[PDB]
């Protein structure tokens, strides 16, 4: 047993084993929708960015017709990489080896000496670069390798309820700012994934240094004091397709010292958000998030950092750090949020620098044979979770909880066990049977007030 | 554009040598105080790989950067090493700088434009080792019997940083 | 086959193959007693040291009661390493991720927000750190993962006869002196293992510069000359459980230039050793040893270097170099032995620096496919050996021999073939059948 | 399929996959004759070099009787490497561990303390360093491991017709000039192999800056412009055992800026070469070659660079660059050719430095799973090829083609599929059936003039 | 073998520092005319691993060498990088030099024999990094005001070059 | 202690530059005579990874140490390289030092407290390469020729040595 959804525990082979990584690449990264980027990274027709779909290099390009297309960054001639630039504007991509010109959708448009050497016998339509399915959600561009997969709408599914709160907001929505901060971290891709999905428990201990100096609202978390009630101060969420996040109330501009533009933006837009998405989602709109979109995209709403974990084997990843910001926010406010986000969660971040060893140590400790045969515990908040009357999916009582952990590894187990999407789609009705307490929030809300 | 005299070059070399000792010994408060001015702009911009035919301008302070701090925000970074209970850094990582190719130029108004190469070697725990190479660009002015940097631009060589973090001063 | 005990030869796959290394980890380092340290490394109650048990990290801790417990250095929550310090004093070990504190025996004593977040719905008895069995022999602490294994004293077995000569001696015994010199050598763990078990043949050739420079009684070995009688100069030994060592007669303080404390200690304590263990073991007490304890510990009594080869895969190891010194010796003598041991066999040792390529080249030459299909030869002095009347186990004629080589790979082959200890325990009365000449020492002495 | 000979395409798994490399090492490097060196590298009795045969370290030695013997550079005692010197003169090789003396033929001749410690019981006859089967052709020394393999002349076969043009020529022949230039390149060994066998197509595109600067005859290739007639400018050949090369007419001393002695040597020797072999091979004698001998030797006759690609796994090689010069040429001309060859195709070569990425990027692009499951095209000039009534094997109309590419991977597929040399030799009469245009050159020659 | 004076040592140090800046900034044409003589011999011989008992003489210019160029052949190499359009170098590799142990000695005819240690750090694309340790032996003359090298022997440490190429000036 | 004058700092730099050349060329006997005092204490302590709350004293020359030699024991180490037939040194392995951050201070009685960073790059055989970074604390002493070190404390960065050995001076 790699993952135990009933007991809420996982084997240490998940971070270390190379054959498990082979199953992950086949039944997750070559199946589910992966984050390519945003339309702000490729705004004008012709603009493109090279990015990773796990270990596959891909060129996301903004098309001349208006659509967004992506394809594998590899020439059909000898396999050579077509484009090496991180970003730019190009109507056609030329390979550096022989000069095969590729189109904006990866179609082989032209080849040098076609009439002379090839004698026009080269079937260029069959020699197109392996195209990738591209779909957008509120500007955020995703990518998928499986034709039999569902839509990006359905893949997010009930998680769209939450995303709409911030990714639409008061009509403006949000966008990514580049260029990103690329850096290699010697750890498994799931350790930062599980961390950013619902690890409010480490915030007080690991980031006790930074939180104490900054002060404000989040200073009380430092040292893991038992006096402060975390159940009333926050909540946690998890969905059908492994998407989940923790939320801290009234801490949107938490870590920001220079937050005038960002704080005023929320106070001006909270009235519109209360009207659109109700007071239940306005509560989230004013709070600090710690989200991971399955499998390998994470972000912190409020702190406004946006990360994507590109796996490079079972023991290493390449962390791409963007800065997520509102569209309708001022250019000065966007620059302010960028500086504060990078100062906190950049390559030399005041917080991010603390997690460095926490990610690597968990992975490379499994180098020992007796160690990796052991197991991991994710049972924080077992019994105190279930379907909320208002909020969709499963909800936890506190942000310092492991409801998101369980939901992440449950969908992981489902994807790893299932041979195809047809087997996954069959369990749409009975996916949350592993969460036994059904009448939890009914009894809890009746006891309150 | 005029290169500084050999005697002035020694004092700038000696300033950076003292500055390196304070980084390695962990005397950041004492560095921030003497060898850093209150109008400092500590800047480490993010250079992305572009084609040579690309006509876009180089990254400005308004654009994304790893470091982009003033004295107050730079002071906040320093206090994490002192007042903070950072578990990664008990004990502190051993760092060692190798400054070379120091070339000062008279920038007028008693200000000096200095260019230099920096090779940072970092060691922590048992077998972990990471190496970084940077191209520093400074503006130093004479303040009392010494120097103080007020503009500082650090150009990283590697696009993808092969390290847990870049939390170290140069 | 991998090992041939009959003809005394081994395949080159033993130093290279991945699947063999996977079988080694499981059928050796996860079954045998591995050297953790000594009481001197953790003298007072509360003192601890982090160390390796192969590729597993473990925390050896002196309990408040006095006993010693060890457990895997990994938090039961997410698997993160609990303690990164080499040594120190601690009544509890806190994990750096979320703050899970563990006791001296590796039990989950307390966790932050257990009342609030967990609601006391956490079986902390079952979520303790993976404990390891810990037994000690004359101060020297060992560790074992397999619960079905025998005792440490029985695992040593007939080898105890020899160990008692030096690890007890006059009465005090010996103790390690840290901190150790850690260093990575790109080679298989067996190559140093076989070297220190009985490779006196390489000493005259490889360390011809060091021996000729230092001079003395060990200077004659340099160059490998046939005129000197090696049969009279020393002997070689090997036991049932893979342990073995060579000995040079009256060469204890051979490599030491400054040796007023170490030599005079032996001169004062030899009379006590002669009374207790007799003249047969007095011979060993004055001689320079050359030992390896199976699997992966080794030392040199005389030069007083103590090494443990922690494997990091089939083509890499981490060498921890402690300094083994006598307890009853004076503080000045202990420090003198430490400097001489490190100067000879340290990281920048005058001898150890010569062996660098000899370890690595033997392993990495098997990168080629045609090379690794070849075989190695350990047949120096086959037949010229057998059961000694006085000394237990099997003994060889000269220290320059491969009796310990044969005995090392023989038990190695047995451990690799046996699925459990019951299969190994079955062949206690038929382990030395590979050595044919039983009436060798009976005729030689007559 | 790993290689498709009908459609002329190969899978990208060949550059990347470890199991394919395991087969390559079993079925190609352990079978085919590998280039060890030349007589000139070890000219006199006692002379040796250390070189590789794949990942195996070997010691080639010039014997007392004049013959050449090779053996594995590894001691029979504990495996330790015997000789670390790149070259020298020695009547015996002593292992540095214990001192086991090995002869020139790799026989364990002497052991320290044999009578004393070993008691003369050590069977030294059976403990010889494993000998490699050595055979030579026109000075060039080869090495083989398989006992059932054919002779060196049979292995070359049809290709010797071409080799005799240059490796004998006027009578002098050719020789290698050491010491070589050793350097690691992060790529598969087949990418340089296919490049030097017949990639005239990349020469104009990749080396446009270098060729345009030098000028002369080869300056016209810069940019691969359609105006020029590539068919008349050269040809391309391939043979049974995968040996093949392209030719550029009257461009031998093309890249040589200082070509005084080299061109004068050709002008003096072209007459006797014409009378010996004929005007069809005189055309070749004056032309610029780009050859690869299967599996892993390659050279450029004219520019006079000689390379051997020693594989260090599927994703790395060690390039050994020699300089190939004629025996009868003057010492000053040899040194002039040496400098011009290294300046062009050395470690810091003006041309070879351009190809650095083209080799590595083609290999490491297959790090992604979706990428490496794709395919590579090699259909340039398919159909425009066949058996020549004068030249042996299969010939192509232009040197900018992929006849050699097809023929290289065709024999590669034959070796990887066949379980032994007996199964290979069965295809002697039906190897070139994959080239369907039988009546190509008969129609071409009769239609012309 | 007379060591140069401290005043002359700085001028040679400042010359190599200005020389390093030109390689890093990619100003090869100005280097080729301003800091190199027209009778230059740029040489980098191929040393091989021999036994100590071997008595064969060390590599000469007649033997094999990675570099063995005159002035025109150096100009052939420089103009490739400058006017040409190399795809491998679009964009362009980040390079950085770290000169050390600059010991100069006086020779005949106002010439200076200079020994120097060089560490070259090269970065390119996303995660590609290579290091080269090298020993430099030069003969410099005083082109007032001003130095110009006319002999340059580069000694590589590693036998097998762990890099795609060695196409960079020292 | 007060920092040394520019003229004195140059002589110490020139002394170390010469000292490095003697290590690289393999002139260990001439080094020991000229450049080393007869009461030398060559010391390289084995530093341990300890928690910040742990208040044990720093290692001392009678705790474990890699180097802990006097002049007579330094001769033993030098004579191994000369008269000895070490096989790992056929051929002799290449080493290259990069001394930086040299800062001298007047201790007293004609003695100089000198701190400096050292980066050792070692190469041997075909593809074997190892790097070492370490801090050096010296007490130099003036005499007829120039200087002679009588105390030398070398501080290794890495806990676990990623090399076959540390058999090299400084
Ligand atoms: C995961 C990642 C970051 C945080 C977080 C850090 C600081 C302030 C607020 C939340 C919580 C969970
Ligand atoms: C194996 C290892 C070391 C020695 C040895 C070396 C020097 C002095 C005494 C024994 C003998 C065999
Ligand atoms: C393959 C390799 C090299 C060349 C070539 C390069 C320059 C000049 C002449 C031929 C052609 C094909
Ligand atoms: S590899 Fe892209 S054109 Fe040949
Ligand atoms: S991992 Fe050790 S506390 Fe959670
Ligand atoms: S290993 Fe070569 S002689 Fe023992
Ligand atoms: Fe965090
Ligand atoms: Fe030894
Ligand atoms: Fe080319
Ligand atoms: Zn200053
Ligand atoms: Zn500024
Ligand atoms: Zn970096
Ligand atoms: Zn100048
Ligand atoms: Zn010259
Ligand atoms: Zn190099
Ligand atoms: Zn001096
Ligand atoms: Zn001292
Ligand atoms: Zn080190």
Numbering used by the authors:
A (entry chain A), D (entry chain E): 6 to 454
B (entry chain B), E (entry chain F), F (entry chain D): 5 to 174
C (entry chain C): 6 to 451
Copy text verbatim from the article accompanying this structure deposition:
Previous structural investigations of ROs have demonstrated that substrate bound in the active site is oriented such that the carbon(s) oxidized in the dihydroxylation reaction is (are) closest to the mononuclear iron. This trend is also seen in the structure of BPDO-OB1 bound to biphenyl. The 2 and 3 carbons of biphenyl are positioned closest to the iron, with a water/hydroxide molecule bound to the iron positioned between the substrate and the iron. Crystals were grown and biphenyl was added in the presence of atmospheric oxygen. The enzyme was oxidized and no electron source was added; therefore, catalysis did not occur. We are unable to determine whether the iron is coordinated to a water molecule (hydroxide ion) or an oxygen molecule at this resolution. No significant changes in the active site main chain were observed near the mononuclear iron compared to the native structure. The loop covering the active site entrance of BPDO-OB1 shifts upon binding of biphenyl. The loop main-chain was pushed slightly away (~0.2–0.3 Å) from the substrate in the complex structure, while the main-chain proximal to the mononuclear iron remained static. Comparing the ligand bound structures, biphenyl carbons 2 and 3 are closer to the mononuclear iron in BPDO-ORHA1, 4.3 and 4.6 Å respectively, as compared to BPDO-OB1 which has an average distance of approximately 5.0 Å for both the 2 and 3 carbons in the three subunits.
